[PDB]
Amino acid sequence: MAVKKIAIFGATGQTGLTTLAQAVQAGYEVTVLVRDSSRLPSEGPRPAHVVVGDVLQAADVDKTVAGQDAVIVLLGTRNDLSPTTVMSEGARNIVAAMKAHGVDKVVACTSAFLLWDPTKVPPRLQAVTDDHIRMHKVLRESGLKYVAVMPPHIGDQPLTGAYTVTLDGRGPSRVISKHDLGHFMLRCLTTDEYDGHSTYPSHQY
Ligand SMILES: NC(=O)c1ccc[n+]([C@@H]2O[C@H](COP(=O)([O-])OP(=O)(O)OC[C@H]3O[C@@H](n4cnc5c(N)ncnc54)[C@H](OP(=O)(O)O)[C@@H]3O)[C@@H](O)[C@H]2O)c1
Ligand SMILES: C=CC1=C(C)/C(=C/c2[nH]c(/C=C3N=C(/C=C4\NC(=O)C(C)=C4C=C)C(C)=C\3CCC(=O)O)c(CCC(=O)O)c2C)NC1=O
Known part of the structure; x- marks a missing residue:
């Protein structure tokens, strides 16, 4: 049984908007909280x-x-x-x-x-990073199937579907397009291979 119905939180944000558009175009029945x-x-x-x-x-x-x-x-x-x-x-x-x-x-x-x-966290991003870490802890300890997506800089480059996913934060670049990030979030709905893992999507545009 594949995923058909999804909720997206943060759908009005930069990555959310394109993830939402992609999800609907791909056939998902999407609910958003805004x-x-x-x-x-x-x-x-x-x-x-x-x-x-x-x-x-x-x-x-x-x-x-x-x-x-x-x-x-x-x-x-x-x-x-x-x-x-x-x-x-x-x-x-x-x-x-x-x-x-x-x-x-x-x-x-x-x-x-x-x-x-x-x-290496820039001082100005430390407070948000501290809450990302709290969020990751909450999700990791939940006992649910959890894919942690840990992107580098989110850019505005086109959708490619051609990015690389590593498990350790090393990869071909320190950027992922918002469109490719959303594409990857959707890919994670149709595989279990990243459940319980941290993932690092990046690409050279
Ligand atoms: N920018 C970067 O390069 C970068 C790099 C790596 C990781 N990240 C992290 O990646 C994640 C996605 O970033 P993004 O730029 O796509 O996000 P974003 O543009 O900041 O959008 C945040 C989304 O969260 C929603 N939201 C915030 N508070 C909410 C609340 N109380 N109830 C319901 N929804 C709420 C916002 O809703 P509204 O539209 O109502 O404001 C919006 O949809 C963020 O956690 C960010 O820190 C960003
Ligand atoms: C308004 C704040 C803000 C600005 C202007 C900003 C700029 C900024 N983010 C970058 C990448 C990045 N930016 C982030 C993360 C984030 N970026 C975010 O705005 C948020 C909220 C996160 C999440 C904590 C990451 C992970 C990278 C990696 C890019 C790289 O490695 O070069 C870079 C490339 C290298 C550099 O720092 O000189 C810049 C300039 N980052 C910021 O946070």
Whole structure:
């Protein structure tokens, strides 16, 4: 039985928007949780279901996860670099909702800093990185099938589907296009080969 129904968290963000468009075009029945539906586009592929609410509200997350086959997590803080627990608290709610509803597959984006030497995190990104680490811990300890996606710099290059995925943070470059990152999140829905692993997508454009 393959995945047909998915929830995407963070669908209005840079990577989320293209992951959403790609998922719908690929045939998935997609539900999104958004705080502000005006951030979803009118042109192009459209999600099947829109829940208005907040990943910090358990009931909103529960409504989004109910009935799904898998969950994609592309939560982030946009340009806000201050200390934060939004992603990890969101992940706690997602895990609880998954367990309440029998959903067992989550693919979630943090960053390659969780693979690279931690002394290399730029000071300005440390607070967000600390919450990525809390989120990764939550997902790893959940006992669900969890693919940790840890990308380098997210760029605007075209979709290629030709990127390289390593398990250790080394690879052909330190960039992945947002489109290729979304393509990889979707690839993780049709294989178990990355479950329980950390993954590093990168490409030379
Ligand atoms: N930028 C880089 O080069 C880079 C590199 C490696 C890793 N990353 C990490 O990759 C992940 C994806 O980044 P991105 O740039 O695609 O993301 P992004 O543009 O920051 O988008 C964040 C998404 O999270 C949603 N969100 C935030 N708080 C929420 C809340 N309380 N309830 C519901 N949704 C909420 C946002 O919703 P709204 O639209 O409502 O704001 C938006 O959809 C992030 O965790 C980022 O730190 C980024
Ligand atoms: C507004 C903040 C912000 C800016 C302007 C920024 C710039 C920035 N990010 C880069 C890559 C990168 N940027 C990130 C990660 C992130 N980038 C993010 O904005 C967030 C929120 C994360 C997640 C913690 C990563 C993992 C790389 C690896 C790119 C490389 O190795 O060269 C690079 C390439 C090398 C360099 O640092 O000189 C720059 C300049 N990074 C920032 O964080």
